[PDB]
Design an enzyme around this catalytic site. Structure first.
Site, mmCIF file in Angstrom:
data_model
loop_
_atom_site.group_PDB
_atom_site.id
_atom_site.type_symbol
_atom_site.label_atom_id
_atom_site.label_comp_id
_atom_site.label_asym_id
_atom_site.label_seq_id
_atom_site.Cartn_x
_atom_site.Cartn_y
_atom_site.Cartn_z
ATOM 1 N N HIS A 196 0.739 -1.198 -0.052
ATOM 2 C CA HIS A 196 0.053 -0.005 -0.133
ATOM 3 C C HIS A 196 0.994 1.181 0.019
ATOM 4 O O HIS A 196 0.149 2.124 -0.011
ATOM 5 C CB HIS A 196 -0.877 0.012 1.297
ATOM 6 C CG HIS A 196 -2.121 -0.879 1.286
ATOM 7 N ND1 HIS A 196 -3.195 -0.887 0.384
ATOM 8 C CD2 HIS A 196 -2.252 -2.288 1.724
ATOM 9 C CE1 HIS A 196 -3.762 -1.914 0.574
ATOM 10 N NE2 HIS A 196 -3.336 -2.706 1.475
ATOM 11 N N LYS A 222 -8.812 15.025 2.996
ATOM 12 C CA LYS A 222 -7.871 13.338 3.355
ATOM 13 C C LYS A 222 -7.186 13.611 4.618
ATOM 14 O O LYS A 222 -7.343 14.746 5.065
ATOM 15 C CB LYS A 222 -7.272 13.047 2.091
ATOM 16 C CG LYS A 222 -6.248 14.643 1.657
ATOM 17 C CD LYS A 222 -5.695 14.100 0.329
ATOM 18 C CE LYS A 222 -6.900 14.273 -1.097
ATOM 19 N NZ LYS A 222 -6.591 13.002 -1.795
ATOM 20 N N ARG A 223 -6.194 12.673 5.151
ATOM 21 C CA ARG A 223 -5.485 12.665 5.938
ATOM 22 C C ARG A 223 -4.439 13.983 5.541
ATOM 23 O O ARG A 223 -4.099 14.029 4.316
ATOM 24 C CB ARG A 223 -4.731 11.303 6.504
ATOM 25 C CG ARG A 223 -5.711 10.572 7.276
ATOM 26 C CD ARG A 223 -6.120 11.001 8.517
ATOM 27 N NE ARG A 223 -4.949 11.001 9.381
ATOM 28 C CZ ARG A 223 -4.407 10.048 9.889
ATOM 29 N NH1 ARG A 223 -4.922 8.881 10.251
ATOM 30 N NH2 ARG A 223 -3.151 10.438 11.032
ATOM 31 N N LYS A 241 0.430 14.787 0.380
ATOM 32 C CA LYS A 241 -0.630 15.202 -0.084
ATOM 33 C C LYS A 241 -0.865 16.711 -0.444
ATOM 34 O O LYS A 241 -1.972 17.088 -1.273
ATOM 35 C CB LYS A 241 -1.853 14.917 0.910
ATOM 36 C CG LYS A 241 -1.941 13.225 1.121
ATOM 37 C CD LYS A 241 -2.917 12.743 1.976
ATOM 38 C CE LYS A 241 -3.128 11.327 2.044
ATOM 39 N NZ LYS A 241 -3.636 10.647 1.075
ATOM 40 N N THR A 270 -8.782 6.706 -3.104
ATOM 41 C CA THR A 270 -9.907 6.356 -3.351
ATOM 42 C C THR A 270 -11.093 7.445 -3.000
ATOM 43 O O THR A 270 -12.170 7.388 -3.284
ATOM 44 C CB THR A 270 -10.365 5.360 -2.155
ATOM 45 O OG1 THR A 270 -10.184 5.463 -0.797
ATOM 46 C CG2 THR A 270 -9.605 3.968 -2.553
ATOM 47 N N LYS A 308 -14.448 8.349 -5.080
ATOM 48 C CA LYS A 308 -15.751 8.782 -4.564
ATOM 49 C C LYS A 308 -16.544 10.032 -5.209
ATOM 50 O O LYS A 308 -17.463 10.220 -5.540
ATOM 51 C CB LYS A 308 -15.720 9.311 -3.028
ATOM 52 C CG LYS A 308 -15.163 7.968 -2.289
ATOM 53 C CD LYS A 308 -14.572 8.231 -0.825
ATOM 54 C CE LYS A 308 -14.043 7.096 -0.317
ATOM 55 N NZ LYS A 308 -13.261 7.292 0.853
HETATM 56 C C1 LIG Z 1 -12.130 7.447 1.369
HETATM 57 C C2 LIG Z 1 -11.529 8.139 2.631
HETATM 58 C C3 LIG Z 1 -10.211 8.422 2.799
HETATM 59 C C4 LIG Z 1 -9.208 8.207 1.666
HETATM 60 O O1 LIG Z 1 -8.692 9.708 1.255
HETATM 61 P P1 LIG Z 1 -7.573 9.622 0.108
HETATM 62 O O2 LIG Z 1 -7.923 11.161 -0.503
HETATM 63 O O3 LIG Z 1 -7.881 8.598 -1.061
HETATM 64 O O4 LIG Z 1 -6.519 9.683 0.788
HETATM 65 C C5 LIG Z 1 -9.779 9.096 3.821
HETATM 66 N N1 LIG Z 1 -10.615 9.521 4.959
HETATM 67 C C6 LIG Z 1 -12.081 9.008 4.775
HETATM 68 C C7 LIG Z 1 -12.743 9.230 6.007
HETATM 69 C C8 LIG Z 1 -12.579 8.325 3.693
HETATM 70 O O5 LIG Z 1 -13.850 8.097 3.563
HETATM 71 C C1 LIG Z 2 -0.080 2.765 4.059
HETATM 72 C C2 LIG Z 2 -1.362 3.265 3.557
HETATM 73 O O1 LIG Z 2 -2.063 3.826 4.692
HETATM 74 N N1 LIG Z 2 -1.654 3.226 2.273
HETATM 75 C C3 LIG Z 2 -3.001 4.073 1.625
HETATM 76 O O2 LIG Z 2 -3.689 2.873 1.201
HETATM 77 C C4 LIG Z 2 -4.566 3.081 0.359
HETATM 78 C C5 LIG Z 2 -5.668 1.825 0.076
HETATM 79 O O3 LIG Z 2 -4.672 0.662 -0.776
HETATM 80 C C6 LIG Z 2 -4.350 3.991 -0.980
HETATM 81 O O4 LIG Z 2 -5.338 4.238 -1.891
HETATM 82 C C7 LIG Z 2 -3.509 5.211 -0.406
HETATM 83 O O5 LIG Z 2 -2.878 5.651 -1.688
HETATM 84 C C8 LIG Z 2 -2.373 5.008 0.561
HETATM 85 O O6 LIG Z 2 -1.642 6.207 1.055
#
Ligand SMILES: *Cc1c(COP(=O)(O)O)cnc(C)c1O
Ligand SMILES: CC(=O)N[C@@H]1O[C@H](CO)[C@@H](O)[C@H](O)[C@H]1O
Ligand SMILES: O=C(N[C@@H](Cc1ccccc1)C(=O)N1CC(C(=O)O)C1)c1cc2cc(Cl)ccc2[nH]1
Ligand SMILES: O=C(N[C@@H](Cc1ccccc1)C(=O)N1CC(C(=O)O)C1)c1cc2cc(Cl)ccc2[nH]1
Ligand SMILES: *Cc1c(COP(=O)(O)O)cnc(C)c1O
Ligand SMILES: CC(=O)N[C@@H]1O[C@H](CO)[C@@H](O)[C@H](O)[C@H]1O
Lengths: 786, 786
Positions: free
Chosen positions: A333, A524-525, A530, A632, A636
């Protein structure tokens, strides 16, 4: 019918909550409803598990330290096709179902993408009728609740179990002991692991209902329990229970804490014994069992399966090692080095002495083979061993995962390629077929039917509802490319979402939202790779522009940036403060007015994503090329009617492939441009000069325009940005800002903006986790979607 | 009815336990049954509490740190008159109800007598239809499970909540904060206790059904919850939750640990706020509220009520102090000095600084009065102050309880007299009417109907069942004094009990029980004042006698001694070992055979008492005169068909008064004989010589006849016995052994033994807790039994 739902509800309020309508709290109503809905799961749940015992199809075990589940009530009502009936029953009882649903706590047992992928996989696996189980840890406390104080993030304990969890079922009869520490004793009977400390593992099962298909699977989460002064001895029982107390809040960062290692071995030991136990009810083990390793977190499962096979089942090493490889599969990942799991052999030796021996063994057999193939390539050996001899000896869990598995997959084309051809070139070269790709996905139930009922309906009114179980069916929305009424309807749905979410931002934050502005969102986090910073640089650049020319025709924006930072991530916290500081200056400036508003969505989490995402127009997916393995959130947003502005990274690339690069706002450096800029040597000072608007941005930050009381407050950022930005923010600023202007250009043309949106939604079929799982089932677990 | 009970049971197994008959565990069946029975409590429970709100009768609040509840299932079935129907339904479903009932854990939230008196009071108060509430702490771990290892007691954590408690109901809407530490600020807006640490108190309600009367009361127990490194900060939340983690296992012993003080203030603060809150839904407060202080444990309630009245409600001290005294009542449960609660002013100052000020205040007003009445009696002041200035200043919680209450009661005539005329002579002299007596009692439901169905039936077949709610009705069993058939029937019941309990001892211990022997039992907490030693000296004396003359006509005995020792009580543990050592030597000796068997009933607790008591012939109640404030086990045995051998102590005296001294085997020194022997000066060595059988007993102990491998093992006992026995064991040995022979004499005459038994059972009416509560209601709480 409604009548029976109302009767059941009343029955539970009374018997289960011991309440009357004159004394019931809002919480009592939610619990009564949950129970009413929960009962509808029992029959199918027992039937499903019973059916797996009888027909014995190969089972899939998704082993993960995280499961970002979110709320269960609604998801369950939809997947069981009871939402409309329940909405009605609750309405007739004079209650607000939306109000009751808000009472439910998010099961935030995950940090972000990885944890959420596990949750979407469970839903999909149940919808495809596979015999799948999720195995994880039941953290008493999930990811912390985020609050902003004086512009900074403050953490509060997420005590999600305080008032009870109706969706979990204790399975006391399956409790099992887990061993820690102790010592290895080599005797005539074999190698014994004795004098160990024991910790009991109590499994809690949670039903996973498939969408409209009679299937209800299981997510089994383990909780730790304990097996001189008497009072103090009793209190020390807490030490053992600390193992499943709280989820480590790190996203893409490796922290080598002993307690973490304990959690990992804990979930691994309990899970494997439980699987073995179930199996014996060994030559056909891998034909019945498939265990997917979600990243290297459960890597210990490999030596643990071996340990069971060898030390307990008395199987010969050769045979055991064969069954093991056929049993495991590993998913990679990440690519960031600071996220790589590398445990010090000293820590492992003390805590898991027998496993260290087993890992050494594996490595020995492994390295001997390499020499027996490349007798002279000396540097290739150390480069391929599961052990890093440098300085303090540590274990490369990724390497352990590669040799112990028959398949390794990345989570997106670009990512899987980098994992196969670069990162693990030595391994891929030896075992070509071993490395695969499985592009991520999201479940269209929670991320469409549930979170955007307006869109789901609009779509179903145009092409039927087959799309729910076969998202590729969305390609049929193309037939409406010229249909103006449909396009007006599409934008209407988006508008309702924005208006509903605005009322949310209104009550939560004292800011008047321009309901007609463009919703620019990056949730996102928080992490440097990012780039919430780059986005921030843009917001500040838009601020100035309005100041210099407040009359200029400007497309109004509502910029929303939200996400949690890992408690120990200083830069991320600085960036959060930087953003809240910027927001204040922009939100209160009299000249900007309702032209630009900045919001920092607090406590970003699954249930909140379900709110903001559907209300978005522009999705920020601007990670440095090569950093985001897949992402992901990008999907969404695509599925929910937003246009994407981002780099050619992770799955963003495949989103352009599907929708057509021209229908996404790609920009900045690409994977190769990053390589080149590296070799040359990045010098941020140059762009700082060549780009005038940037200099102004930067100077305002460093001079204290956003931090009067503390002129050098953000120096840490400026410092990093000028001499330690391994994510090249400045290098994509020009292209980024350039791209952003174009976004506003298109926004002024509603008809064209919605035309591109339709092409995006119509092309999101590929990113359904249902497609992802079918590929995993067929090419990795070798199981059949029933 | 049976059909509906079976349907409900199946409903719960399915919906509530998610099980089928092919996969349900024994635990699942118990839980399904409990739920089935629990539902029958809801209606009445809501009705009862609602009725109290509407008619607003004065409420009684029983504040105790302990509630030795035992198991709930059966008690609930009986009191609701559902046992026969349930027994039938479970039988028809092919299950063993007795088997299911054994799965339930004892709610052992008490140490012994004091905790069990609280439990019997709840049952009685509910049966008398009073508006009563029990307020205590919900310990995650109750009194430890006792196991014997190598003849010694070993403690195991009593994790009673592991698998869940169906009888408790979380009441989240009544959670409240509790303050600790901090400091005080006397502002011009009242005194302010600031900078305190907060701990949340979450109440858990448990229904208390009255016997066949539509009343279901509440027992509210509080649990503690929490309101630098992030991971560690979350773990430190355990520190706050430690407050309600485990019950202190001391019986009649004061241990001044800070955590204990925290528990005490904790239950006190939460309880009073909750009462105040309920009241306001203050001049009429004491006409609506009555709070009984169960011993000095909740003493802090006095200054806490004052604190609320003064610092929060802004009432004048004078008015507040008046309402307080009218609100509280204090029950004294002990006379032993090492049990007296005396907290160091330093500990209280740091933890409860505001309360220390308030206690000082109370004492000041208090002492000023004494001088204003006895202007020169200087030594009387310090003798009456709530503060002990000696060495390290400490607080006499008893004195705080006396001045803050309008009534103080002992628990037995002899005890209450000693409390009023000697211990608190100075206080009783000033406030004559304040001190009262309220002889203890036991509930005839659990200790007769439930535990001895055979006897209850026999009795009801002869005089009806009015006796259940009016135990004095038992005096009618006198009419059968000459009835031989009835007497044969009485002994039959006793026999069935012995045979059933024997099968218990058979499977638990590898000892063949002479089913025709006399069951000599002494079960209670282990303590020197209780004299399990004296008993032990007797058993050894009987052993020798059989050795010297194995042909002598001897009445066979099965001596059972059981009870837990406080972990930190060295002597008690030695005594346990001494007894197990003796048992081994007696049980295995080939010459003694089935003539004498010694058993140490392990893990003596409430549910176990219900088994052994009904199977007893001879009840050991041999505490040194003046030590046992009352005792209640003595009553249970009396009501269950056993004859009593004991001293004129506690309620033993009143048992002789009721049944006739000649119908009990009284012996040894009396209260005055103890006084005399004191003044003279006790010298155990003398009896050691004057009594030949004793010397032999003693020498065997000290020489190692019972501890070969360790000749001087019991030296600690011999030492204590010869130079530090503040309970004069040797001084009652001669009379004791003399009395014992007479007991065996009578046993040989079945007709006479059962005649005395009948007189005992027929005279036990007075010891029903129903009578005790009626007296408390009428002369202390001033409430009316409805
Ligand atoms: C899907 C989801 C994420 C993933 O975010 P990325 O922009 O793909 O890092 C993070 N937090 C929540 C609450 C989500 O639903
Ligand atoms: C170590 C970790 O949390 N990896 C995270 O995993 C998700 C699910 O595969 C990826 O979409 C994302 O880019 C990545 O930063
Ligand atoms: O706990 C009961 N119901 C349960 C119902 C419940 C169960 C699971 C999730 C939400 C609600 C309850 O209220 N909770 C379990 C939670 C916890 O463990 O904190 C809170 C209950 C019903 C009842 C009825 C009677 Cl008569 C007596 C005691 C009772 N307890
Ligand atoms: O927890 C459930 N039932 C409860 C039933 C119960 C409640 C109170 C006491 C004993 C048993 C349960 O099994 N336990 C509560 C105990 C604990 O807190 O450890 C154990 C439950 C039923 C169910 C049915 C579905 Cl479909 C999904 C989730 C479910 N949980
Ligand atoms: C009643 C009871 C007690 C009190 O016993 P005494 O011999 O009266 O001191 C103690 N423990 C249990 C378990 C009881 O049932
Ligand atoms: C400190 C303590 O537990 N006191 C105990 O209280 C019970 C109940 O009043 C008495 O019967 C008993 O004799 C006495 O020892």
């Amino acid at each position: 019918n409604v009548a029976e739902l109302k009767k059941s509800f009343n029955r539970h309020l009374h018997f289960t909550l011991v309440k009357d309508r004159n004394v019931a709290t809002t919480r009592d109503y939610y619990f009564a409803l949950a129970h009413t809905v929960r009962d509808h799961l029992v029959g199918r749940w027992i039937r499903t598990q019973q059916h797996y015992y009888d027909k014995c199809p190969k089972r899939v075990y998704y082993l993960s330290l995280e499961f970002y589940m979110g709320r269960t009530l609604q998801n369950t009502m939809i997947n069981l096709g009871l939402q409309n009936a329940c909405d009605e029953a609750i309405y007739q009882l004079g209650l607000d179902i939306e109000e009751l649903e808000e009472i439910e706590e998010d099961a935030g047992l995950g940090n972000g993408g990885l944890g959420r992928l596990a949750a979407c996989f469970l839903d999909s696996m149940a919808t495809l009728g596979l015999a799948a189980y999720g195995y994880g840890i039941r953290y008493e406390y999930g990811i912390f609740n985020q609050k902003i104080r004086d512009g900074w993030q403050v953490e509060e304990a997420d005590d999600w179990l305080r008032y009870g969890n109706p969706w979990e079922k204790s399975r006391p009869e399956f409790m099992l002991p887990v061993h820690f520490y102790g010592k290895v004793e080599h005797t005539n009977t074999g190698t014994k692991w004795i004098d160990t400390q024991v910790v009991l593992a109590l499994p809690y099962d949670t039903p996973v209902p498939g969408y409209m298909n009679n299937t209800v699977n299981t997510m089994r989460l383990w909780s730790a329990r304990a097996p001189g002064d008497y009072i103090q001895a009793v209190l020390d029982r807490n030490l053992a229970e600390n193992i499943s107390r709280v989820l480590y809040p790190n996203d893409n960062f490796f922290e080598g804490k002993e307690l973490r290692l304990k959690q990992e071995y804990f979930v691994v030991a309990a899970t494997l014994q439980d699987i073995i136990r179930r199996f014996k009810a060994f030559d056909a083990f891998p034909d019945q069992v498939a265990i997917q390793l979600n990243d290297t977190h459960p890597a210990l499962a490999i030596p643990e399966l071996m340990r069971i096979f060898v030390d307990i089942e008395k199987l010969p090493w050769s045979k055991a090692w064969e069954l093991t490889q056929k049993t495991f599969a590993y998913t990679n990942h990440t690519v960031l080095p600071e996220a790589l799991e590398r445990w010090p052999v000293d820590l492992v030796e003390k805590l898991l002495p027998r496993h260290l021996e087993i890992i050494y063994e594996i490595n020995q057999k492994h390295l001997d083979r390499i020499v027996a193939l490349f007798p002279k390539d000396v540097d290739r050996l150390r480069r391929m061993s599961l052990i890093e001899e440098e300085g303090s000896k540590r274990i490369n869990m990724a390497h352990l995962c590669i040799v112990g598995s028959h398949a390794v997959n990345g989570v997106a084309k670009i990512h899987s390629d980098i994992v196969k051809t670069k990162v693990f070139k030595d391994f891929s070269e030896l075992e070509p077929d071993k490395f695969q790709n499985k592009t991520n996905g999201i479940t269209p139930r929670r991320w469409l039917l549930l979170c955007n009922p307006g869109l789901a309906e609009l779509i179903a009114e145009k092409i039927g509802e087959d799309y729910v179980k076969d998202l590729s069916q969305l390609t049929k929305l193309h037939s409406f490319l010229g249909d103006d009424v449909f396009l007006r309807e599409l934008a209407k749905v988006k508008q309702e979402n924005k208006l509903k979410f605005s009322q949310f931002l209104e009550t939560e934050y004292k800011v008047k939202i321009n309901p007609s502005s463009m919703f620019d969102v990056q949730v996102k986090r928080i992490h440097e790779y990012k780039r919430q910073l780059l986005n921030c640089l843009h917001v500040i650049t838009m601020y100035n522009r309005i100041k210099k020319d407040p009359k200029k025709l400007f497309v109004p924006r509502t910029v929303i940036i939200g996400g949690k930072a890992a408690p120990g991530y200083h830069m991320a916290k600085m960036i959060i403060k930087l953003i809240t500081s910027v927001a204040d200056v922009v939100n209160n400036d009299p000249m900007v007015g309702s032209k630009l508003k900045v919001i920092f969505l607090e406590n970003y989490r699954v249930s909140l994503a379900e709110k903001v995402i559907p209300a978005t127009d522009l999705s920020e997916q601007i990670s440095t090329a090569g950093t985001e393995a897949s992402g992901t959130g990008n999907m969404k947003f695509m599925l929910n009617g937003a246009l994407t502005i981002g780099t050619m990274d992770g799955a963003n690339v495949e989103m352009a492939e599907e929708a057509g690069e021209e229908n996404l706002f790609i920009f900045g450096m690409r994977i190769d441009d990053v390589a080149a800029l590296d070799k040359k040597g990045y010098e941020a000072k140059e762009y700082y000069e060549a780009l005038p608007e940037l200099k102004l941005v930067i100077d305002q930050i460093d001079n204290g325009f956003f931090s009067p009381k503390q002129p050098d407050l953000f120096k840490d950022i400026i410092n990093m940005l000028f001499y330690h930005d391994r994510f090249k923010v400045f290098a994509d600023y020009e292209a980024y800002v350039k791209c952003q202007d174009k976004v506003s250009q298109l926004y002024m043309n509603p008809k064209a903006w919605n035309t591109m949106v339709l092409k995006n939604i119509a092309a999101s079929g590929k990113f359904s986790s249902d497609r992802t799982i079918k590929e995993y089932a067929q090419n990795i677990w070798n199981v059949e979607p029933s």
